[PDB]
Curated annotation (Swiss-Prot), chains A, B, C, D, E, F:
Shown residues in whole-protein numbering: 278 to 377 of 1435
Job description of the protein: Forms the conical core that encapsulates the genomic RNA-nucleocapsid complex in the virion. Most core are conical, with only 7% tubular. The core is constituted by capsid protein hexamer subunits. The core is disassembled soon after virion entry. Host restriction factors such as TRIM5-alpha or TRIMCyp bind retroviral capsids and cause premature capsid disassembly, leading to blocks in reverse transcription. Capsid restriction by TRIM5 is one of the factors which restricts HIV-1 to the human species. Host PIN1 apparently facilitates the virion uncoating.
Entry's localization field: Virion
Site location (Cleavage): L88, A89
UniProt PTM: Phosphorylated possibly by host MAPK1; this phosphorylation is necessary for Pin1-mediated virion uncoating.
Region of interest called Dimerization/Multimerization of capsid protein p24, as start-end residue ranges on this chain: 3-88
Subunit structure and binding partners: Homodimer; the homodimer further multimerizes as homohexamers or homopentamers. Interacts with human PPIA/CYPA; This interaction stabilizes the capsid. Interacts with human NUP153. Interacts with host PDZD8; this interaction stabilizes the capsid. Interacts with monkey TRIM5; this interaction destabilizes the capsid.
Protein known as: Capsid protein p24
Organism: Human immunodeficiency virus type 1 group M subtype B (isolate NY5) (HIV-1)
Length: 102, 102, 102, 102, 102, 102
C-alpha cells in the first residue's frame, strides 16, 4: 500500500498534459496490484482527483463515469495556455456575466 | 497497444511550439506503420485534438487539417507567449467586446 | 539537532505540487528523529506553515483534522495553472463579488 | 526529407527572445546547404513565423526583414517579462483603449 | 571585487522562494570573510535587494530589522503561484479597490 | 572584430536578472579588448539596449548613466514575477489610469 507509484501518489503537473500524466498513472497501475474494476476507481476518480486542477476541475464537471474519450478530449484543454485560455474566458466571464454572484 | 507511439496520443506541449511537435507527430509516424490515407487522421485531426488547444482553435480557425504550411503558419501563434501575443487580447475582447455573453 | 531537511527548513516550491514537497517533508521527516506523536504535529502544522501559500491557504481552508487523502484532494487545487484555474475566477471575485472591501 | 536544422523546424521558444532564436535560425542554416537569397524566406519570413509570436507581433509592426540591428533592438522586446514590460499593456489596449472592437 | 558569491552577485530566482535563496546568500556568506555586523548588510539590505522582488517588496513592508524568521514567514508568500495568490490578487485591487489611482 | 561576445551582441535573458547578465557583459567585456572609456559606452548604452527590456524600460526611467548600484537596485525589479509585481500593476494602469490614451 502506497508502494512507489501505486496511483495513490501519481501526479499531473500544471505543465504536465493529461494524456501525459495518464501514462504515469496507467503504467503504474500495472505496477500496482489492482483488479480491473478497482483500477477503474483509479482512472475514473483518482485520475480526476490527484491530477492537475485543469483536469480535476474538468473530469469532475463532465462528471465521473463519462468515457475516457469524453474526458480525453475535454482534458486535452489541460496544458497551461490551452486551458488557461478557456479558463480565462469562463472565469473572466463568470465573475462578470455568467456567474456574477450577488 | 503500448508499443511506442501508434499516433493515438502523440503530443504537442502546451508551450512547446507546434513545429517541434510536428516533427514529433511525424516522428512516431515514421515508426508507425500508418498507410498514407490512414495517416490522414494522424496529420489532420491528431494534429488538432492532442496537439495543444492553441492549434485546436487555430486549425479550427483555418479549417481542421489545413495544409502543413497553413495549420503551421497559423500555428506559430501556439506556445505560451506565442498565443499570449494574440489570444490574450482576443479572449480579453471575447469576454468584453466581441463575445460578451449576456 | 534541527539538522538540514529534517523539517526545520522544509520549504515548498510555490508551484511545486502539494504532495511533491510533502513527499520531501515526509521522506525527510525520516531524517528527523521524531516521536510518532512528535512527528504528526509537524505534518499538519509545519507542513502548512512553510509550504505553498496555495496549499497553506487551502489546508487552512479545509480546516485542520483533514486526512492527507483529504488535504491532497483540496490542495491538488495548488499549482500554476492548477491554482490559477481556481483562483482566477475567485480572486477576480474577491475584489468584485465575495470579498469586496468597502 | 525529415532532416532537422533546415529551418523547416527551427524555432524560438515562446519565452525565448528574438535574438536567442536568431542564432538558432542563422547557425542552423550553417548546417543547411543554401544560397544567401535562398536563406531569405527564412531570415525574413520563418524568422517571422516560428520565431515566438512575441516577435511576430513586433515584426508585424516593425516590419519583416528589418536589419539584424533593427529586428534586434526591436524584437529585443520579445521575452517573458521582457515583452511584458510593454505587450501586456498593449493587449490591454487592443481590447479596451486603442484597438477596441465594437 | 567580482569574487564569486560575495552577496554582491548573490541572487534569488524571480520564482525562487525566499529561504532557498537565503541558503545561497548565507552559504556563501560563511565564505565571505566578514564580521557579524558586515554579514548584517548582506542580511539586512542585500538580502532584500536581490531576493526576488516578490519578497523585496515584502521585507520592506515588514521593514528591515525583522528576524530572518519574520521575513521568512511573511516571505513564504514569495513564489510564483505562491506570491501571486496573495500579491497578484493584491494587484487586481491595485487597479480597482485599494490602489485605484486618481 | 565582432568576435563573439564583444558586447555588440551581449544579451540578457528575458527572465535573466539584470545583475546576472551584467556579469555576462562585464566578464565578456574582459574578453573584449576595449578602452575603459569605450567600455563605458558599452556599459551605459549597450547595457541598456540589449539587456532584457525589463531593464530597458527601467534604466531608461532612472536615467541612462545611472550608477550600476542605481540600475541594479531598480533592475532588481527585472524578472518574471519580480518585474510583474510592479509592471503588471503598471501596464494595467497604463491603459486605464495613468497612460490612458484618448
Ligand atoms: O510564473 P508566472 O509569473 O506565473 O508566469 C509564467 C512565466 O512567465 P513570465 O515570463 O511572465 O514570468 C513563465 O516564464 P518562464 O520563466 O518559464 O520563461 C511562462 O513561460 P513561457 O513563456 O515559456 O510560456 C509561464 O508559462 P508556462 O507555465 O506555460 O511555461 C507563465 O505562466 P502562466 O502562463 O501560467 O501565466
Ligand atoms: C491566459 C494566458 C495564456 C495563460 C496568459 C495571458 C496573459 C499573459 C500575460 C501578458 N502577455 C502578453 C503577451 C505576451 C507575453 C509574453 F509572456 F509572451 F511575453 C505576456 O506576458 N499577462 C498575465 C500573466 C499572468 C499570470 C497570472 C496572473 C496575471 C497575469 C497577467 C500571459 C499568459
Amino acid at each position: 500500500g502506497g508502494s512507489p507509484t501505486s496511483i495513490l501518489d501519481i501526479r499531473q503537473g500544471p505543465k504536465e498534459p493529461f494524456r501525459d500524466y495518464v501514462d504515469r498513472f496507467y503504467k503504474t497501475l500495472r505496477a500496482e496490484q489492482a483488479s480491473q474494476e478497482v483500477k477503474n476507481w483509479m482512472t475514473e476518480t483518482l485520475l480526476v482527483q490527484n491530477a492537475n486542477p485543469d483536469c480535476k476541475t474538468i473530469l469532475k464537471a463532465l462528471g465521473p463515469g463519462a468515457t475516457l474519450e469524453e474526458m480525453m478530449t475535454a482534458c486535452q484543454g489541460v496544458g497551461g495556455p490551452g486551458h488557461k485560455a478557456r479558463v480565462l474566458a469562463e472565469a473572466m466571464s463568470q465573475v462578470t456575466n455568467t456567474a456574477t454572484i450577488m
